[PDB]
């Protein structure tokens, strides 16, 4: 897993600096990942959830660590906080919480040491 400095603007300065491609949406470049995640930018700016930027970036520009090769998804709780605060506004604009980002696909904080998640 070769690490790339994050170049997607809205994912700069979120807690980690390096990502790896392709991401889970099969985007093979950060230009493609950024083109999609920046569609959410209005929701980040209106602050429907303080967790939204980190949650989205943890999927679109997932964390890359120098030696550690295992995946590090966001935690189910982070997703649930973001879905709680932002899915009502999304429905008001005429959309729905994206099916790809259903929180029950995410590991639970501390429930397992075989699948680690990101929260804090």
């Amino acid at each position: 897993p070769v690490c790339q400095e994050i170049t997607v603007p809205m994912c700069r300065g979120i807690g980690y600096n390096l990502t790896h491609m392709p991401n889970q949406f099969n985007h093979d470049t950060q230009d493609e990942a950024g083109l999609e995640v920046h569609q959410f930018w209005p929701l980040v700016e209106i602050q429907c959830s303080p967790d939204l930027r980190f949650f989205l970036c943890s999927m679109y520009t997932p964390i890359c660590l120098p030696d550690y090769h295992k995946p590090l998804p966001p935690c189910r709780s982070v997703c649930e906080r973001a879905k709680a605060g932002c899915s009502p506004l999304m429905r008001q604009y005429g959309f729905a919480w994206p099916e790809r980002m259903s929180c029950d696909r995410l590991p639970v904080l501390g429930r397992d040491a075989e699948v680690l998640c990101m929260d804090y």
């Epitope: 603007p9 809205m10 949406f25 985007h27 230009d31 493609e32 990942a33 950024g34 083109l35 999609e36 995640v37 920046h38 569609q39 959410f40 930018w41 209005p42 999304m90 604009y93 005429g94 959309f95 729905a96 994206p98 099916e99 790809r100």
Partner: antibody, heavy 120, light 107 residues
């Protein structure tokens, strides 16, 4: 380099059908948002429809809902506007346009427009 | 259904003149208002987004501002190539347009 090119415009009988194409270069449509905007001769701009890859959504203006359908051929990096049951009031120049990157709230790249004439 | 009412519908002004175009939302809206310039036979070109942010490459004489439900596009010094119709746009993800302002150059 980064651009949009439309094709498919021309004459169609009232109640007929016509498919427009919006061919992209320099970015992948399947990770972007493509909108359609039309302009009747001598009139103003009217927003018609849009897809968002982020939301996985397709939205149609009430004036065309039920008659117009969007699809895409990702291998050709081309979006389509399928028009059915065409009316005289659908006569217009049709534009496709990209949702503004990175900041949103607007349409940054536009195709050159193609004229659809609904006449017998 | 938000309505954007644009005024004036047309205007004439000399090179070097200051030109102001106004678009009024029918109800309280956010600053999600954009301005476009459309020249004959061409697609609209984005000038301003989010009421007052200048788009890439847009000349310094264009600017935007808002007061309440009133959004204004200002050309500080009209140039002959600024002949166009100007449109306001409302919306975050789905858009509605004002009816346009035709700007003609007095010479």
């Amino acid at each position: 380099e980064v651009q949009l090119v439309e094709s498919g415009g021309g004459l169609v009988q009232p109640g007929g059908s016509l498919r427009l194409s919006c061919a992209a270069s320099g970015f992948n449509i399947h990770s972007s948002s493509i909108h359609w905007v039309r302009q009747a001769p001598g009139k103003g701009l009217e927003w018609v429809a849009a897809t968002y890859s982020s939301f996985g959504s397709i939205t149609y203006a009430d004036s065309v809902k039920g008659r117009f359908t969007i699809s895409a051929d990702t291998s050709k990096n081309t979006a389509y506007l399928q028009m059915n049951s065409l009316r005289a009031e659908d006569t217009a120049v049709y534009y496709c346009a990209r949702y503004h990157h990175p900041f949103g709230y607007a349409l940054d790249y536009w195709g050159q427009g193609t004229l659809v004439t609904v006449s017998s | 259904d938000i309505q954007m009412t644009q005024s004036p519908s047309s205007l004439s002004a000399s090179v070097g003149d200051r030109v102001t175009i106004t678009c009024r939302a029918s109800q309280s809206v956010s600053s999600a208002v954009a301005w476009y310039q459309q020249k004959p036979g061409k697609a609209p070109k984005l000038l301003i987004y989010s009421a007052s942010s200048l788009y890439s490459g847009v000349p310094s004489r264009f600017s935007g501002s808002r007061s309440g439900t009133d959004f204004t596009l200002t050309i500080s010094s009209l140039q002959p190539e600024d002949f166009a119709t100007y449109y306001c746009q409302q919306g975050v993800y789905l858009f509605t347009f004002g009816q346009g302002t035709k700007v003609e150059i007095k010479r």
